[PDB]
PDB file of all heavy atoms in Angstrom:
ATOM      1  N   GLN A   1      98.804 113.030 106.895  1.00  0.00           N
ATOM      2  CA  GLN A   1      99.058 114.468 106.849  1.00  0.00           C
ATOM      3  C   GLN A   1     100.030 114.903 107.926  1.00  0.00           C
ATOM      4  O   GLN A   1     100.974 115.645 107.648  1.00  0.00           O
ATOM      5  CB  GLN A   1      97.764 115.255 107.031  1.00  0.00           C
ATOM      6  CG  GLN A   1      96.730 115.094 105.968  1.00  0.00           C
ATOM      7  CD  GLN A   1      95.855 113.898 106.210  1.00  0.00           C
ATOM      8  OE1 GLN A   1      95.874 113.305 107.286  1.00  0.00           O
ATOM      9  NE2 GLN A   1      95.062 113.549 105.219  1.00  0.00           N
ATOM     10  N   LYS A   2      99.819 114.435 109.153  1.00  0.00           N
ATOM     11  CA  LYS A   2     100.582 114.946 110.280  1.00  0.00           C
ATOM     12  C   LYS A   2     102.033 114.495 110.224  1.00  0.00           C
ATOM     13  O   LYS A   2     102.923 115.240 110.645  1.00  0.00           O
ATOM     14  CB  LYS A   2      99.891 114.536 111.581  1.00  0.00           C
ATOM     15  CG  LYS A   2      99.863 113.051 111.871  1.00  0.00           C
ATOM     16  CD  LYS A   2      98.794 112.746 112.907  1.00  0.00           C
ATOM     17  CE  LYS A   2      99.119 113.360 114.241  1.00  0.00           C
ATOM     18  NZ  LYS A   2      98.054 113.058 115.218  1.00  0.00           N
ATOM     19  N   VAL A   3     102.307 113.328 109.648  1.00  0.00           N
ATOM     20  CA  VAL A   3     103.699 112.968 109.450  1.00  0.00           C
ATOM     21  C   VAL A   3     104.251 113.583 108.174  1.00  0.00           C
ATOM     22  O   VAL A   3     105.477 113.681 108.026  1.00  0.00           O
ATOM     23  CB  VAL A   3     103.906 111.445 109.461  1.00  0.00           C
ATOM     24  CG1 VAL A   3     103.368 110.865 110.738  1.00  0.00           C
ATOM     25  CG2 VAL A   3     103.258 110.800 108.299  1.00  0.00           C
ATOM     26  N   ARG A   4     103.390 114.024 107.256  1.00  0.00           N
ATOM     27  CA  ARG A   4     103.907 114.771 106.116  1.00  0.00           C
ATOM     28  C   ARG A   4     104.346 116.170 106.516  1.00  0.00           C
ATOM     29  O   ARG A   4     105.472 116.582 106.223  1.00  0.00           O
ATOM     30  CB  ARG A   4     102.870 114.848 105.003  1.00  0.00           C
ATOM     31  CG  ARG A   4     102.715 113.558 104.264  1.00  0.00           C
ATOM     32  CD  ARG A   4     101.794 113.714 103.096  1.00  0.00           C
ATOM     33  NE  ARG A   4     100.421 113.969 103.488  1.00  0.00           N
ATOM     34  CZ  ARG A   4      99.481 114.338 102.631  1.00  0.00           C
ATOM     35  NH1 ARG A   4      99.786 114.517 101.352  1.00  0.00           N
ATOM     36  NH2 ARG A   4      98.246 114.561 103.044  1.00  0.00           N
ATOM     37  N   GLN A   5     103.459 116.918 107.164  1.00  0.00           N
ATOM     38  CA  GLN A   5     103.819 118.240 107.649  1.00  0.00           C
ATOM     39  C   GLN A   5     104.870 118.157 108.741  1.00  0.00           C
ATOM     40  O   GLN A   5     105.684 119.072 108.880  1.00  0.00           O
ATOM     41  CB  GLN A   5     102.566 118.975 108.134  1.00  0.00           C
ATOM     42  CG  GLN A   5     101.829 118.321 109.285  1.00  0.00           C
ATOM     43  CD  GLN A   5     100.544 119.041 109.647  1.00  0.00           C
ATOM     44  OE1 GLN A   5     100.242 120.109 109.111  1.00  0.00           O
ATOM     45  NE2 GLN A   5      99.770 118.448 110.546  1.00  0.00           N
ATOM     46  N   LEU A   6     104.878 117.063 109.501  1.00  0.00           N
ATOM     47  CA  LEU A   6     105.977 116.781 110.406  1.00  0.00           C
ATOM     48  C   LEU A   6     107.272 116.566 109.651  1.00  0.00           C
ATOM     49  O   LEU A   6     108.335 116.942 110.144  1.00  0.00           O
ATOM     50  CB  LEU A   6     105.640 115.550 111.247  1.00  0.00           C
ATOM     51  CG  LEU A   6     106.474 115.105 112.453  1.00  0.00           C
ATOM     52  CD1 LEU A   6     105.560 114.421 113.458  1.00  0.00           C
ATOM     53  CD2 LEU A   6     107.604 114.154 112.079  1.00  0.00           C
ATOM     54  N   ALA A   7     107.205 115.956 108.477  1.00  0.00           N
ATOM     55  CA  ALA A   7     108.414 115.715 107.714  1.00  0.00           C
ATOM     56  C   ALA A   7     108.943 116.990 107.077  1.00  0.00           C
ATOM     57  O   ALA A   7     110.163 117.187 107.016  1.00  0.00           O
ATOM     58  CB  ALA A   7     108.153 114.654 106.649  1.00  0.00           C
ATOM     59  N   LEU A   8     108.042 117.852 106.594  1.00  0.00           N
ATOM     60  CA  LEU A   8     108.454 119.167 106.116  1.00  0.00           C
ATOM     61  C   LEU A   8     109.059 119.976 107.244  1.00  0.00           C
ATOM     62  O   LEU A   8     110.105 120.617 107.078  1.00  0.00           O
ATOM     63  CB  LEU A   8     107.260 119.902 105.513  1.00  0.00           C
ATOM     64  CG  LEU A   8     106.741 119.293 104.217  1.00  0.00           C
ATOM     65  CD1 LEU A   8     105.470 119.980 103.774  1.00  0.00           C
ATOM     66  CD2 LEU A   8     107.807 119.394 103.137  1.00  0.00           C
ATOM     67  N   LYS A   9     108.457 119.883 108.427  1.00  0.00           N
ATOM     68  CA  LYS A   9     108.973 120.516 109.635  1.00  0.00           C
ATOM     69  C   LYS A   9     109.959 119.566 110.331  1.00  0.00           C
ATOM     70  O   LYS A   9     109.876 119.266 111.518  1.00  0.00           O
ATOM     71  CB  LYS A   9     107.780 120.895 110.506  1.00  0.00           C
ATOM     72  CG  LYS A   9     107.965 121.755 111.743  1.00  0.00           C
ATOM     73  CD  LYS A   9     106.595 122.062 112.347  1.00  0.00           C
ATOM     74  CE  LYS A   9     106.075 120.933 113.229  1.00  0.00           C
ATOM     75  NZ  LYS A   9     105.300 119.897 112.476  1.00  0.00           N
ATOM     76  N   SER A  10     110.861 119.001 109.536  1.00  0.00           N
ATOM     77  CA  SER A  10     112.051 118.364 110.080  1.00  0.00           C
ATOM     78  C   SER A  10     113.282 118.892 109.365  1.00  0.00           C
ATOM     79  O   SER A  10     114.198 119.475 109.963  1.00  0.00           O
ATOM     80  CB  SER A  10     111.927 116.849 109.926  1.00  0.00           C
ATOM     81  OG  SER A  10     113.124 116.190 110.269  1.00  0.00           O
ATOM     82  N   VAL A  11     113.248 118.744 108.044  1.00  0.00           N
ATOM     83  CA  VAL A  11     114.283 119.287 107.189  1.00  0.00           C
ATOM     84  C   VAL A  11     114.154 120.794 107.144  1.00  0.00           C
ATOM     85  O   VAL A  11     115.155 121.504 106.988  1.00  0.00           O
ATOM     86  CB  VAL A  11     114.185 118.618 105.807  1.00  0.00           C
ATOM     87  CG1 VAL A  11     112.777 118.758 105.238  1.00  0.00           C
ATOM     88  CG2 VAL A  11     115.225 119.170 104.845  1.00  0.00           C
ATOM     89  N   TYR A  12     112.933 121.290 107.345  1.00  0.00           N
ATOM     90  CA  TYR A  12     112.640 122.697 107.528  1.00  0.00           C
ATOM     91  C   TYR A  12     113.468 123.237 108.680  1.00  0.00           C
ATOM     92  O   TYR A  12     114.231 124.180 108.490  1.00  0.00           O
ATOM     93  CB  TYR A  12     111.151 122.889 107.794  1.00  0.00           C
ATOM     94  CG  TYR A  12     110.701 124.321 107.802  1.00  0.00           C
ATOM     95  CD1 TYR A  12     110.463 124.996 106.610  1.00  0.00           C
ATOM     96  CD2 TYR A  12     110.518 125.002 108.994  1.00  0.00           C
ATOM     97  CE1 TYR A  12     110.051 126.311 106.611  1.00  0.00           C
ATOM     98  CE2 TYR A  12     110.115 126.311 108.998  1.00  0.00           C
ATOM     99  CZ  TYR A  12     109.876 126.959 107.809  1.00  0.00           C
ATOM    100  OH  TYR A  12     109.465 128.273 107.819  1.00  0.00           O
ATOM    101  N   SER A  13     113.374 122.582 109.840  1.00  0.00           N
ATOM    102  CA  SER A  13     114.132 122.976 111.026  1.00  0.00           C
ATOM    103  C   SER A  13     115.631 122.859 110.818  1.00  0.00           C
ATOM    104  O   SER A  13     116.407 123.674 111.336  1.00  0.00           O
ATOM    105  CB  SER A  13     113.729 122.094 112.195  1.00  0.00           C
ATOM    106  OG  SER A  13     114.107 120.753 111.943  1.00  0.00           O
ATOM    107  N   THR A  14     116.056 121.808 110.112  1.00  0.00           N
ATOM    108  CA  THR A  14     117.469 121.646 109.787  1.00  0.00           C
ATOM    109  C   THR A  14     117.961 122.813 108.948  1.00  0.00           C
ATOM    110  O   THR A  14     119.075 123.315 109.137  1.00  0.00           O
ATOM    111  CB  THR A  14     117.669 120.326 109.050  1.00  0.00           C
ATOM    112  OG1 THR A  14     117.160 119.259 109.858  1.00  0.00           O
ATOM    113  CG2 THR A  14     119.142 120.077 108.765  1.00  0.00           C
ATOM    114  N   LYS A  15     117.107 123.297 108.060  1.00  0.00           N
ATOM    115  CA  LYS A  15     117.430 124.475 107.281  1.00  0.00           C
ATOM    116  C   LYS A  15     117.267 125.748 108.101  1.00  0.00           C
ATOM    117  O   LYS A  15     117.829 126.793 107.752  1.00  0.00           O
ATOM    118  CB  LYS A  15     116.547 124.484 106.045  1.00  0.00           C
ATOM    119  CG  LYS A  15     116.917 123.425 105.035  1.00  0.00           C
ATOM    120  CD  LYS A  15     118.179 123.820 104.337  1.00  0.00           C
ATOM    121  CE  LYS A  15     117.885 125.083 103.567  1.00  0.00           C
ATOM    122  NZ  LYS A  15     118.965 125.520 102.700  1.00  0.00           N
ATOM    123  N   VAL A  16     116.505 125.681 109.196  1.00  0.00           N
ATOM    124  CA  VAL A  16     116.374 126.836 110.075  1.00  0.00           C
ATOM    125  C   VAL A  16     117.674 127.081 110.805  1.00  0.00           C
ATOM    126  O   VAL A  16     118.258 128.166 110.720  1.00  0.00           O
ATOM    127  CB  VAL A  16     115.216 126.650 111.071  1.00  0.00           C
ATOM    128  CG1 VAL A  16     115.287 127.703 112.153  1.00  0.00           C
ATOM    129  CG2 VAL A  16     113.895 126.742 110.379  1.00  0.00           C
ATOM    130  N   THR A  17     118.152 126.076 111.532  1.00  0.00           N
ATOM    131  CA  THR A  17     119.355 126.288 112.319  1.00  0.00           C
ATOM    132  C   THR A  17     120.582 126.271 111.419  1.00  0.00           C
ATOM    133  O   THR A  17     121.596 126.914 111.716  1.00  0.00           O
ATOM    134  CB  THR A  17     119.431 125.229 113.411  1.00  0.00           C
ATOM    135  OG1 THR A  17     118.158 125.156 114.061  1.00  0.00           O
ATOM    136  CG2 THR A  17     120.461 125.613 114.461  1.00  0.00           C
ATOM    137  N   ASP A  18     120.481 125.582 110.280  1.00  0.00           N
ATOM    138  CA  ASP A  18     121.552 125.599 109.291  1.00  0.00           C
ATOM    139  C   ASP A  18     121.675 126.975 108.652  1.00  0.00           C
ATOM    140  O   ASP A  18     122.785 127.459 108.406  1.00  0.00           O
ATOM    141  CB  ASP A  18     121.281 124.537 108.227  1.00  0.00           C
ATOM    142  CG  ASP A  18     122.492 124.239 107.363  1.00  0.00           C
ATOM    143  OD1 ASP A  18     123.574 124.806 107.603  1.00  0.00           O
ATOM    144  OD2 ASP A  18     122.356 123.437 106.418  1.00  0.00           O
ATOM    145  N   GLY A  19     120.546 127.619 108.379  1.00  0.00           N
ATOM    146  CA  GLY A  19     120.556 128.935 107.788  1.00  0.00           C
ATOM    147  C   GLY A  19     120.998 128.991 106.346  1.00  0.00           C
ATOM    148  O   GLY A  19     121.332 130.079 105.861  1.00  0.00           O
ATOM    149  N   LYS A  20     121.016 127.862 105.638  1.00  0.00           N
ATOM    150  CA  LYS A  20     121.386 127.908 104.230  1.00  0.00           C
ATOM    151  C   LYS A  20     120.203 128.332 103.369  1.00  0.00           C
ATOM    152  O   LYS A  20     120.363 128.619 102.177  1.00  0.00           O
ATOM    153  CB  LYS A  20     121.952 126.560 103.787  1.00  0.00           C
ATOM    154  CG  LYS A  20     123.192 126.157 104.557  1.00  0.00           C
ATOM    155  CD  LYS A  20     124.292 127.191 104.416  1.00  0.00           C
ATOM    156  CE  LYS A  20     124.834 127.229 103.002  1.00  0.00           C
ATOM    157  NZ  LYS A  20     125.492 125.947 102.669  1.00  0.00           N
ATOM    158  N   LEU A  21     119.005 128.351 103.942  1.00  0.00           N
ATOM    159  CA  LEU A  21     117.947 129.158 103.364  1.00  0.00           C
ATOM    160  C   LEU A  21     118.289 130.615 103.622  1.00  0.00           C
ATOM    161  O   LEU A  21     118.816 130.954 104.686  1.00  0.00           O
ATOM    162  CB  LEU A  21     116.590 128.795 103.969  1.00  0.00           C
ATOM    163  CG  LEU A  21     116.276 128.973 105.463  1.00  0.00           C
ATOM    164  CD1 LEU A  21     115.702 130.345 105.822  1.00  0.00           C
ATOM    165  CD2 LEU A  21     115.306 127.910 105.903  1.00  0.00           C
ATOM    166  N   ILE A  22     118.014 131.480 102.656  1.00  0.00           N
ATOM    167  CA  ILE A  22     118.206 132.913 102.846  1.00  0.00           C
ATOM    168  C   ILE A  22     116.950 133.629 102.377  1.00  0.00           C
ATOM    169  O   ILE A  22     116.514 133.440 101.238  1.00  0.00           O
ATOM    170  CB  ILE A  22     119.454 133.446 102.119  1.00  0.00           C
ATOM    171  CG1 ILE A  22     120.735 133.036 102.859  1.00  0.00           C
ATOM    172  CG2 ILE A  22     119.391 134.961 101.953  1.00  0.00           C
ATOM    173  CD1 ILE A  22     121.364 131.747 102.388  1.00  0.00           C
ATOM    174  N   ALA A  23     116.362 134.423 103.267  1.00  0.00           N
ATOM    175  CA  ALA A  23     115.210 135.254 102.951  1.00  0.00           C
ATOM    176  C   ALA A  23     115.556 136.296 101.897  1.00  0.00           C
ATOM    177  O   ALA A  23     116.429 137.143 102.101  1.00  0.00           O
ATOM    178  CB  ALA A  23     114.704 135.934 104.218  1.00  0.00           C
ATOM    179  N   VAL A  24     114.850 136.231 100.776  1.00  0.00           N
ATOM    180  CA  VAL A  24     115.108 137.044  99.596  1.00  0.00           C
ATOM    181  C   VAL A  24     113.818 137.772  99.255  1.00  0.00           C
ATOM    182  O   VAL A  24     112.736 137.189  99.327  1.00  0.00           O
ATOM    183  CB  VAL A  24     115.592 136.159  98.421  1.00  0.00           C
ATOM    184  CG1 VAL A  24     115.762 136.937  97.130  1.00  0.00           C
ATOM    185  CG2 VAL A  24     116.896 135.489  98.760  1.00  0.00           C
ATOM    186  N   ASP A  25     113.917 139.022  98.814  1.00  0.00           N
ATOM    187  CA  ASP A  25     112.713 139.670  98.309  1.00  0.00           C
ATOM    188  C   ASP A  25     112.320 139.163  96.931  1.00  0.00           C
ATOM    189  O   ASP A  25     112.738 138.080  96.508  1.00  0.00           O
ATOM    190  CB  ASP A  25     112.872 141.182  98.253  1.00  0.00           C
ATOM    191  CG  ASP A  25     112.666 141.821  99.589  1.00  0.00           C
ATOM    192  OD1 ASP A  25     111.982 141.202 100.422  1.00  0.00           O
ATOM    193  OD2 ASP A  25     113.133 142.954  99.793  1.00  0.00           O
ATOM    194  N   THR A  26     111.440 139.909  96.267  1.00  0.00           N
ATOM    195  CA  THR A  26     110.941 139.505  94.959  1.00  0.00           C
ATOM    196  C   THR A  26     112.070 139.409  93.943  1.00  0.00           C
ATOM    197  O   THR A  26     112.404 138.313  93.476  1.00  0.00           O
ATOM    198  CB  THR A  26     109.888 140.499  94.484  1.00  0.00           C
ATOM    199  OG1 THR A  26     110.517 141.763  94.251  1.00  0.00           O
ATOM    200  CG2 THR A  26     108.827 140.672  95.552  1.00  0.00           C
ATOM    201  N   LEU A  27     112.710 140.549  93.657  1.00  0.00           N
ATOM    202  CA  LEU A  27     113.731 140.696  92.617  1.00  0.00           C
ATOM    203  C   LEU A  27     113.234 140.138  91.286  1.00  0.00           C
ATOM    204  O   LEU A  27     113.902 139.350  90.614  1.00  0.00           O
ATOM    205  CB  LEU A  27     115.053 140.059  93.047  1.00  0.00           C
ATOM    206  CG  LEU A  27     115.680 140.761  94.251  1.00  0.00           C
ATOM    207  CD1 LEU A  27     116.932 140.041  94.703  1.00  0.00           C
ATOM    208  CD2 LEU A  27     115.980 142.214  93.927  1.00  0.00           C
ATOM    209  N   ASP A  28     112.009 140.521  90.943  1.00  0.00           N
ATOM    210  CA  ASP A  28     111.355 140.081  89.719  1.00  0.00           C
ATOM    211  C   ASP A  28     111.785 141.040  88.617  1.00  0.00           C
ATOM    212  O   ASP A  28     111.487 142.236  88.674  1.00  0.00           O
ATOM    213  CB  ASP A  28     109.841 140.056  89.906  1.00  0.00           C
ATOM    214  CG  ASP A  28     109.127 139.285  88.818  1.00  0.00           C
ATOM    215  OD1 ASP A  28     109.794 138.816  87.885  1.00  0.00           O
ATOM    216  OD2 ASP A  28     107.895 139.131  88.905  1.00  0.00           O
ATOM    217  N   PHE A  29     112.479 140.516  87.617  1.00  0.00           N
ATOM    218  CA  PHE A  29     113.285 141.336  86.731  1.00  0.00           C
ATOM    219  C   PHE A  29     112.561 141.587  85.418  1.00  0.00           C
ATOM    220  O   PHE A  29     111.493 141.040  85.145  1.00  0.00           O
ATOM    221  CB  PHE A  29     114.637 140.664  86.518  1.00  0.00           C
ATOM    222  CG  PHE A  29     115.478 140.625  87.755  1.00  0.00           C
ATOM    223  CD1 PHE A  29     116.384 139.604  87.954  1.00  0.00           C
ATOM    224  CD2 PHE A  29     115.315 141.573  88.752  1.00  0.00           C
ATOM    225  CE1 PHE A  29     117.142 139.543  89.099  1.00  0.00           C
ATOM    226  CE2 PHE A  29     116.078 141.529  89.896  1.00  0.00           C
ATOM    227  CZ  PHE A  29     116.987 140.507  90.072  1.00  0.00           C
ATOM    228  N   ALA A  30     113.156 142.444  84.591  1.00  0.00           N
ATOM    229  CA  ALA A  30     112.504 142.840  83.351  1.00  0.00           C
ATOM    230  C   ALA A  30     112.614 141.743  82.304  1.00  0.00           C
ATOM    231  O   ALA A  30     111.608 141.185  81.861  1.00  0.00           O
ATOM    232  CB  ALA A  30     113.117 144.140  82.829  1.00  0.00           C
ATOM    233  N   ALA A  31     113.831 141.422  81.905  1.00  0.00           N
ATOM    234  CA  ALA A  31     114.053 140.344  80.969  1.00  0.00           C
ATOM    235  C   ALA A  31     114.027 139.027  81.721  1.00  0.00           C
ATOM    236  O   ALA A  31     114.102 138.992  82.950  1.00  0.00           O
ATOM    237  CB  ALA A  31     115.384 140.549  80.250  1.00  0.00           C
ATOM    238  N   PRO A  32     113.878 137.911  81.015  1.00  0.00           N
ATOM    239  CA  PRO A  32     114.147 136.610  81.635  1.00  0.00           C
ATOM    240  C   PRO A  32     115.600 136.167  81.602  1.00  0.00           C
ATOM    241  O   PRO A  32     115.861 135.029  81.993  1.00  0.00           O
ATOM    242  CB  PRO A  32     113.279 135.657  80.802  1.00  0.00           C
ATOM    243  CG  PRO A  32     113.128 136.324  79.501  1.00  0.00           C
ATOM    244  CD  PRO A  32     113.084 137.781  79.781  1.00  0.00           C
ATOM    245  N   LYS A  33     116.537 137.029  81.201  1.00  0.00           N
ATOM    246  CA  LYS A  33     117.909 136.589  80.981  1.00  0.00           C
ATOM    247  C   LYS A  33     118.595 136.230  82.294  1.00  0.00           C
ATOM    248  O   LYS A  33     118.233 136.712  83.367  1.00  0.00           O
ATOM    249  CB  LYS A  33     118.713 137.649  80.241  1.00  0.00           C
ATOM    250  CG  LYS A  33     119.034 138.844  81.070  1.00  0.00           C
ATOM    251  CD  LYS A  33     119.906 139.811  80.329  1.00  0.00           C
ATOM    252  CE  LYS A  33     120.240 140.976  81.223  1.00  0.00           C
ATOM    253  NZ  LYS A  33     121.050 140.513  82.377  1.00  0.00           N
ATOM    254  N   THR A  34     119.556 135.320  82.208  1.00  0.00           N
ATOM    255  CA  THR A  34     120.151 134.742  83.399  1.00  0.00           C
ATOM    256  C   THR A  34     121.539 135.268  83.672  1.00  0.00           C
ATOM    257  O   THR A  34     122.288 134.640  84.419  1.00  0.00           O
ATOM    258  CB  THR A  34     120.197 133.225  83.295  1.00  0.00           C
ATOM    259  OG1 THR A  34     120.984 132.863  82.161  1.00  0.00           O
ATOM    260  CG2 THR A  34     118.799 132.671  83.129  1.00  0.00           C
ATOM    261  N   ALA A  35     121.918 136.377  83.051  1.00  0.00           N
ATOM    262  CA  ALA A  35     122.977 137.171  83.645  1.00  0.00           C
ATOM    263  C   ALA A  35     122.457 137.865  84.887  1.00  0.00           C
ATOM    264  O   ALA A  35     123.206 138.066  85.851  1.00  0.00           O
ATOM    265  CB  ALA A  35     123.508 138.185  82.639  1.00  0.00           C
ATOM    266  N   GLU A  36     121.167 138.207  84.868  1.00  0.00           N
ATOM    267  CA  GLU A  36     120.434 138.761  85.992  1.00  0.00           C
ATOM    268  C   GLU A  36     120.549 137.844  87.183  1.00  0.00           C
ATOM    269  O   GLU A  36     121.217 138.157  88.166  1.00  0.00           O
ATOM    270  CB  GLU A  36     118.956 138.867  85.660  1.00  0.00           C
ATOM    271  CG  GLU A  36     118.582 139.768  84.545  1.00  0.00           C
ATOM    272  CD  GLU A  36     117.135 139.570  84.145  1.00  0.00           C
ATOM    273  OE1 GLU A  36     116.497 138.631  84.666  1.00  0.00           O
ATOM    274  OE2 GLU A  36     116.633 140.344  83.310  1.00  0.00           O
ATOM    275  N   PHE A  37     119.953 136.670  87.048  1.00  0.00           N
ATOM    276  CA  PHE A  37     119.950 135.704  88.123  1.00  0.00           C
ATOM    277  C   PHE A  37     121.288 135.001  88.250  1.00  0.00           C
ATOM    278  O   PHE A  37     121.549 134.366  89.272  1.00  0.00           O
ATOM    279  CB  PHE A  37     118.815 134.709  87.887  1.00  0.00           C
ATOM    280  CG  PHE A  37     117.446 135.349  87.870  1.00  0.00           C
ATOM    281  CD1 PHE A  37     116.835 135.688  86.667  1.00  0.00           C
ATOM    282  CD2 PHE A  37     116.779 135.628  89.056  1.00  0.00           C
ATOM    283  CE1 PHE A  37     115.578 136.277  86.648  1.00  0.00           C
ATOM    284  CE2 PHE A  37     115.522 136.217  89.045  1.00  0.00           C
ATOM    285  CZ  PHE A  37     114.918 136.532  87.839  1.00  0.00           C
ATOM    286  N   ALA A  38     122.148 135.108  87.239  1.00  0.00           N
ATOM    287  CA  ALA A  38     123.515 134.638  87.404  1.00  0.00           C
ATOM    288  C   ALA A  38     124.257 135.501  88.407  1.00  0.00           C
ATOM    289  O   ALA A  38     125.062 134.995  89.194  1.00  0.00           O
ATOM    290  CB  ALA A  38     124.251 134.639  86.068  1.00  0.00           C
ATOM    291  N   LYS A  39     123.981 136.798  88.413  1.00  0.00           N
ATOM    292  CA  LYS A  39     124.694 137.672  89.321  1.00  0.00           C
ATOM    293  C   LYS A  39     123.898 138.022  90.563  1.00  0.00           C
ATOM    294  O   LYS A  39     124.472 138.536  91.527  1.00  0.00           O
ATOM    295  CB  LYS A  39     125.151 138.924  88.575  1.00  0.00           C
ATOM    296  CG  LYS A  39     126.048 138.519  87.414  1.00  0.00           C
ATOM    297  CD  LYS A  39     127.272 137.767  87.938  1.00  0.00           C
ATOM    298  CE  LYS A  39     128.142 137.219  86.824  1.00  0.00           C
ATOM    299  NZ  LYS A  39     127.471 136.072  86.157  1.00  0.00           N
ATOM    300  N   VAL A  40     122.606 137.726  90.574  1.00  0.00           N
ATOM    301  CA  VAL A  40     121.840 137.843  91.801  1.00  0.00           C
ATOM    302  C   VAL A  40     121.953 136.562  92.599  1.00  0.00           C
ATOM    303  O   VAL A  40     122.175 136.592  93.811  1.00  0.00           O
ATOM    304  CB  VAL A  40     120.384 138.205  91.471  1.00  0.00           C
ATOM    305  CG1 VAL A  40     119.511 138.109  92.702  1.00  0.00           C
ATOM    306  CG2 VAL A  40     120.342 139.610  90.940  1.00  0.00           C
ATOM    307  N   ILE A  41     121.820 135.421  91.930  1.00  0.00           N
ATOM    308  CA  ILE A  41     122.132 134.148  92.565  1.00  0.00           C
ATOM    309  C   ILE A  41     123.616 134.068  92.890  1.00  0.00           C
ATOM    310  O   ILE A  41     124.006 133.670  93.998  1.00  0.00           O
ATOM    311  CB  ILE A  41     121.656 132.991  91.671  1.00  0.00           C
ATOM    312  CG1 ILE A  41     120.126 132.896  91.722  1.00  0.00           C
ATOM    313  CG2 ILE A  41     122.301 131.681  92.078  1.00  0.00           C
ATOM    314  CD1 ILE A  41     119.526 132.060  90.615  1.00  0.00           C
ATOM    315  N   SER A  42     124.467 134.519  91.978  1.00  0.00           N
ATOM    316  CA  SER A  42     125.873 134.532  92.339  1.00  0.00           C
ATOM    317  C   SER A  42     126.261 135.775  93.128  1.00  0.00           C
ATOM    318  O   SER A  42     127.449 135.964  93.399  1.00  0.00           O
ATOM    319  CB  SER A  42     126.773 134.387  91.112  1.00  0.00           C
ATOM    320  OG  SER A  42     126.900 135.595  90.404  1.00  0.00           O
ATOM    321  N   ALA A  43     125.300 136.612  93.524  1.00  0.00           N
ATOM    322  CA  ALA A  43     125.596 137.751  94.383  1.00  0.00           C
ATOM    323  C   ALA A  43     125.719 137.365  95.850  1.00  0.00           C
ATOM    324  O   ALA A  43     126.020 138.230  96.677  1.00  0.00           O
ATOM    325  CB  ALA A  43     124.541 138.841  94.213  1.00  0.00           C
TER     326      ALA A  43
END
């Protein structure tokens, strides 16, 4: 367990200082269509 959570908290940290993770709210949409997420993901 401790090397598993250690492993998540390795690439986790790399994504922390890298910042290519981006904190996003819900943005839970009406339709499932992907013009929505095409332009929110591509936003």
Side-chain angles (χ1 to χ4, degrees):
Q1 296 85 12
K2 66 198 294 179
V3 304
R4 286 186 292 169
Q5 61 184 354
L6 190 149
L8 292 173
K9 189 175 82 272
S10 172
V11 54
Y12 188 80
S13 65
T14 304
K15 289 286 296 187
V16 168
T17 312
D18 195 3
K20 300 302 292 295
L21 62 89
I22 285 93
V24 175
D25 280 336
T26 66
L27 295 176
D28 195 357
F29 293 150
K33 72 176 182 64
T34 60
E36 297 169 353
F37 299 97
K39 301 300 175 288
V40 171
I41 287 164
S42 79

